[PDB]
């Protein structure tokens with residue numbers, strides 16, 4: 001076999017840097033690699049400890065090239081949801097993650113591992129996410145949710161068809177296909193957009209959810225592949241205000257914003273697009289704090305990312321990254337990141353993409 | 360190895376080269392031959408007015424890092440493979456400036472020189488500001504510190520201010536870099552002032568009009584014209600987003616922010632951002648009140664997008680460098696940022712080349 005040949009290697013190099021950064025020992029490494037060789041053979045795969053997944057989870061986040069807020073990688077609250085085998089059970093850990101993660105405001109960076117190898121498989125990109133619809137004429141909702149919604153709909157689900165319908169959790173377990181569960185109206189904390197200097201900014205009837213719990217991603221650690229492992233940090237103004245809210249294909253809100261704010265859309269040379277972006281992001285950063293939701297602006301992130309670079313060197317590790325995904329989508333030339341280059345090599349553990357079942 | 364390699368490149372070139380302009384194999388076939396012998400006798404060859412012209416425009420077109428390719432085929436070329444005197448190489452440089460600056464309506468022009476380093480222009484750009492590291496402080500463009508140091512080494516001396524015009528330093532034949540200050544009359548300068556903020560012009564900032572990069576050697580048909588200056592018309596960002604904003608460049612963000620009465624005590628106030636905009640609007644406004652060609656990124660990326668269309672409808676592949684294409688401010692409001700490009704180098708193209716003073 002050549003799955004037990006590779007998997008063995010991945011495991012061996014994991015435990016090595018893993019236990020070694022933990023300041024463990026050299027004996028307990030072989031002691032552990034031993035249990036793993038014996039086990040990978042008699043059973044065909046092995047199982048981690050909760051200092052293995054725990055610290056291993058934090059290592060995957062540290063190793064995420066496309067992430068700007070890696071500073072707080074060690075402060076990750078990991079949850080062992082591996083002992084879940086029933087669809088009911090899965091669901092609860094997912095309702096919990098949301099909760100704990102939200103923390104009625106001061107959002108907690110948390111990851112919840114599940115039975116690996118695909119024994120569990122959540123479908124949603126993000127646990128909380130707005131629906132996508134394409135009606136007779138007009139694109140309603142979040143265009144980047146179309147396919148998924150059209151999959152929920154096909155499973156008996158139906159929305160109100162408003163620009164902010166909260167999609168439902170829909171997971172697949174042991175085999176078959178999926179099941180969904182509307183996600184509690186009082187579980188999804190939201191933030192209404194208001195601008196501190198333009199009162200009309202609310203007639204724009206805009207709003208966004210608090211915690212982005214990405215989940216359609218697989219988590220590899222030591223060779224084991226955790227196809228279902230939700231994780232979340234806290235949003236960055238630009239994310240909502242410079243992408244979700246300002247892109248053509250998404251909620252394309254820039255023009256209306258500009259209009260209401262008196263600028264003229266006639267000529268580009270007036271940079272109305274840009275001025276809008278500022279206010280539209282100001283509104284978001286502003287809004288969230290006012291509600292108490294944990295948020296961070298793009299300037300601070302970079303700065304904290306810079307601290308991450310300093311810290312990582314003081315530890316001896318070199319830093320890996322992805323420039324195309326680090327530069328904040330707004331005034332990116334005002335962050336050190338932009339004036340330097342990064343090595344996009346992926347070091348395990350890391351997070352990866354995976355084919356979407358609904359496509 | 361070296362001379363056979365040349366024919367390989369030289370052929371690959373006349374083919375596609377002749378293809379497009381719309382002529383006929385009977386020639387590519389026949390004039391690709393005299394280049395086989397002329398390389399067996401001397402050791403290279405010489406282009407035709409028709410060849411390096413288009414072939415230069417091809418290079419532009421092949422610029423993976425240029426958002427201004429919608430006008431590749433309107434590049435005013437300028438032959439000068441017949442200059443061999445330092446005094447000559449200078450007046451041509453002076454020409455490029457005048458013709459290009461065109462009293463304002465900037466003309467996209469290039470000037471090809473004798474190849475294989477018989478001519479070497481040292482300056483990054485013909486018109487560019489000097490840089491100094493003074494005891495306490497740094498003056499000018501931190502970017503041209505090193506080069507300037509060189510100019511002073513050759514006897515040049517600057518009034519040590521934020522906007523001194525560097526001198527044109529060229530090398531010819533083989534040695535002794537000579538320099539000669541540019542006629543003040545030839546450097547057109549735009550004063551940055553704000554359409555709404557009357558107190559902006561008080562920051563006493565200015566900038567030249569023509570970015571004539573001059574230290575890249577544009578290969579074409581295996582011929583390295585170490586010297587071959589080219590330009591276009593600025594894009595607001597280049598000036599009010601980089602040159603004037605980076606903390607190492609003119610670090611102008613905080614003062615404009617201050618002068619424009621914002622709060623520079625917190626980033627969650629996006630004070631740098633509001634400032635970037637107003638500084639950029641400040642440029643575009645100014646350059647226009649002077650009558651100098653200049654494009655904004657929204658309009659620019661738009662055009663690049665047209666260049667994309669026209670490249671495909673004409674059955675060509677578009678190659679680019681996303682990281683260089685996306686503008687420094689509001690990159691996610693341009694089609695660019697949202698798609699992927701092919702950073703493959705199609706020659707003829709412009710390249711980098713070691714700085715004789717470092």
Ligand code: HEM
Nearest residue numbers: 061064066067068069109110111231232233234235236351
């Ligand atoms: C502390 C709050 C956090 C901040 C400020 C932060 C910020 C960011 C930002 C701005 C991006 C780019 C998002 C986009 O362009 O769509 C990103 C991507 C990413 N983040 Fe972080 N993050 C945080 C926490 C986390 C946590 C807890 C994990 C992992 C346990 C994580 C894993 C990732 C991954 C894997 C990506 C890539 C997304 C993809 O490939 O689609 N982040 N993060």
Ligand code: HEM
Nearest residue numbers: 419422424425426427430434467589590591592593594709
């Ligand atoms: C129509 C006006 C033009 C515009 C708007 C334009 C704009 C740009 C911009 C904004 C950059 C990035 C500059 C930087 O970040 O330093 C660039 C780079 C470049 N462009 Fe253009 N361009 C124009 C004309 C030309 C012409 C006439 C040529 C060639 C014949 C050319 C050759 C290139 C090259 C080779 C680079 C790379 C410079 C480097 O690597 O430092 N451009 N251009």
Ligand SMILES: NC(=[NH2+])NCCC[C@H](N)C(=O)O
Nearest residue numbers: 212232233234235236239244
């Ligand atoms: N700060 C984060 N954890 N971001 C995760 C990705 C969220 C995604 N960009 C969104 O707007 O939904």
Ligand SMILES: NC(=[NH2+])NCCC[C@H](N)C(=O)O
Nearest residue numbers: 570590591592593594597598
């Ligand atoms: N539009 C151009 N051709 N620019 C050439 C590079 C000029 C450089 N960005 C500068 O600001 O001086």
